[PDB]
Design an enzyme around this catalytic site. Structure first.
Site, mmCIF file in Angstrom:
data_model
loop_
_atom_site.group_PDB
_atom_site.id
_atom_site.type_symbol
_atom_site.label_atom_id
_atom_site.label_comp_id
_atom_site.label_asym_id
_atom_site.label_seq_id
_atom_site.Cartn_x
_atom_site.Cartn_y
_atom_site.Cartn_z
ATOM 1 N N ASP A 164 -7.653 -3.210 -8.028
ATOM 2 C CA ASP A 164 -7.383 -2.371 -6.834
ATOM 3 C C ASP A 164 -7.098 -0.990 -7.272
ATOM 4 O O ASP A 164 -6.262 -0.647 -8.383
ATOM 5 C CB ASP A 164 -5.913 -2.805 -6.434
ATOM 6 C CG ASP A 164 -5.370 -2.281 -5.173
ATOM 7 O OD1 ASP A 164 -5.963 -1.261 -4.792
ATOM 8 O OD2 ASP A 164 -4.280 -2.745 -4.642
ATOM 9 N N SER B 11 0.988 -1.205 0.109
ATOM 10 C CA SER B 11 -0.037 0.098 -0.111
ATOM 11 C C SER B 11 0.791 1.174 -0.180
ATOM 12 O O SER B 11 1.884 1.178 -0.791
ATOM 13 C CB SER B 11 -1.092 0.069 1.155
ATOM 14 O OG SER B 11 -1.875 0.761 0.806
ATOM 15 N N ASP C 225 4.157 0.333 -18.411
ATOM 16 C CA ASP C 225 3.117 1.032 -17.704
ATOM 17 C C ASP C 225 2.430 1.905 -18.636
ATOM 18 O O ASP C 225 2.731 3.097 -19.158
ATOM 19 C CB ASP C 225 3.696 1.814 -16.547
ATOM 20 C CG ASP C 225 2.476 2.634 -15.826
ATOM 21 O OD1 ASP C 225 1.647 2.192 -15.969
ATOM 22 O OD2 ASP C 225 2.889 3.649 -14.893
ATOM 23 N N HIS D 289 -7.633 -4.300 -2.656
ATOM 24 C CA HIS D 289 -6.421 -3.840 -2.021
ATOM 25 C C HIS D 289 -6.010 -4.598 -1.078
ATOM 26 O O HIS D 289 -4.499 -4.096 -0.676
ATOM 27 C CB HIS D 289 -6.541 -2.156 -1.772
ATOM 28 C CG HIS D 289 -5.267 -1.456 -1.303
ATOM 29 N ND1 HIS D 289 -4.073 -1.414 -2.085
ATOM 30 C CD2 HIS D 289 -4.814 -0.793 -0.223
ATOM 31 C CE1 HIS D 289 -3.122 -0.891 -1.618
ATOM 32 N NE2 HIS D 289 -3.700 -0.401 -0.272
ATOM 33 N N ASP E 4 5.189 -5.614 -19.154
ATOM 34 C CA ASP E 4 6.467 -5.086 -19.279
ATOM 35 C C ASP E 4 6.523 -3.607 -19.535
ATOM 36 O O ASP E 4 7.686 -2.851 -19.319
ATOM 37 C CB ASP E 4 7.228 -5.819 -20.333
ATOM 38 C CG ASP E 4 7.405 -7.277 -20.303
ATOM 39 O OD1 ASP E 4 7.242 -7.734 -18.935
ATOM 40 O OD2 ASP E 4 7.469 -7.947 -21.182
#
Length: 270
Positions: free
Chosen positions: A199, A145, A239, A259, A237
């Site tokens: 999440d 987190s 973002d 989460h 691989d």
């Protein structure tokens, strides 16, 4: 998919993040054994790992954690827990850039960097002591987190301050910086960053706000309370807006339960 060995490692290091949530562990006396009263770090307790140093949340900080030594796995472990007011962070947190002096053009999230700089000096001195006392040991920095966000910046910083082979296990981490910083951390290697289904926390801050994740992404696709199989983790691989956890859509508080479930109930000790 991943290999059984990789899966075993991933299920293991998350339990030090789980211990980070226990006030009993981050206020423990030097030499006490790490323990999770709710039964969510059994393999940690099985290693016999003991606390070398710890630091508590209080009136002046929401960050807590510990440095422990694991003689079974030959590792010094630096574990961070951030603020557990995470839903409010998703719903209303404002982000701010800052220049952490890490790399050319690199900007970090001000809140996370600030939490690391607050504890950095003492943690550096303590780590020098513990690594000297355990010279053949690796250094593993871990969190979940918001703690994972602090862990990420701590790792990156420590890798320029004498620990270039520090490992990072960042479960459910927010983005922590811009494209140059993500590229610099990614190139340092030894980065294990996890997301779970949809999440919302790893979706923030947004790509549209200039932030980028460390690559790769270990995306756990199995549901909450589900055992994670070797076939339940996809490796992404880059973002980008359409892949992995981010590809599931813009962050929604209605997804928030995802989460807490990263192999175990990571925050059961809060």
């Amino acid at each position: 998919d991943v290999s059984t060995s990789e899966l075993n490692q991933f299920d293991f290091w998350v339990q030090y993040a789980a211990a980070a949530y226990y006030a009993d562990d981050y206020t423990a006396q030097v030499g006490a054994k790490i323990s999770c009263s709710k039964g969510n770090c059994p393999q940690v307790e099985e290693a016999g790992a003991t606390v070398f140093y710890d630091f508590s949340n209080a009136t002046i900080t929401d960050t807590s954690g510990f440095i422990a030594v694991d003689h079974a796995n030959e590792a010094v472990v630096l574990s961070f827990r951030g603020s557990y007011s995470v839903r409010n962070w998703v719903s209303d947190a404002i982000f701010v850039y800052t220049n952490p002096d890490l790399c050319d053009g690199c900007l970090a999230d001000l809140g996370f960097w600030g939490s690391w700089v607050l504890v950095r000096d003492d943690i550096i001195k303590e780590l020098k002591e513990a690594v000297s006392q355990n010279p053949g040991y690796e250094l593993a920095v871990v969190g979940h987190s918001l703690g994972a966000a602090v862990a990420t910046l701590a790792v990156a910083d420590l890798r320029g301050k004498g620990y270039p082979s520090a490992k990072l296990y960042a479960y459910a981490s927010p983005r922590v910086a811009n494209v140059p910083l993500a590229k610099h951390i990614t190139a340092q290697g030894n980065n294990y960053r996890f997301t779970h289904t949809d999440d919302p926390v790893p979706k923030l801050p947004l790509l549209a706000m200039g932030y980028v994740h460390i690559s790769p992404e270990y995306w756990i696709t199995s549901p909450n309370n589900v055992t994670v199989g070797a076939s339940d983790i996809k490796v992404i691989d880059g973002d980008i807006s359409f892949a992995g956890n981010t590809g599931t859509g813009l962050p929604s508080l209605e997804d928030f339960e995802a989460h807490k479930w990263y192999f175990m109930k990571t925050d059961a000790g809060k």
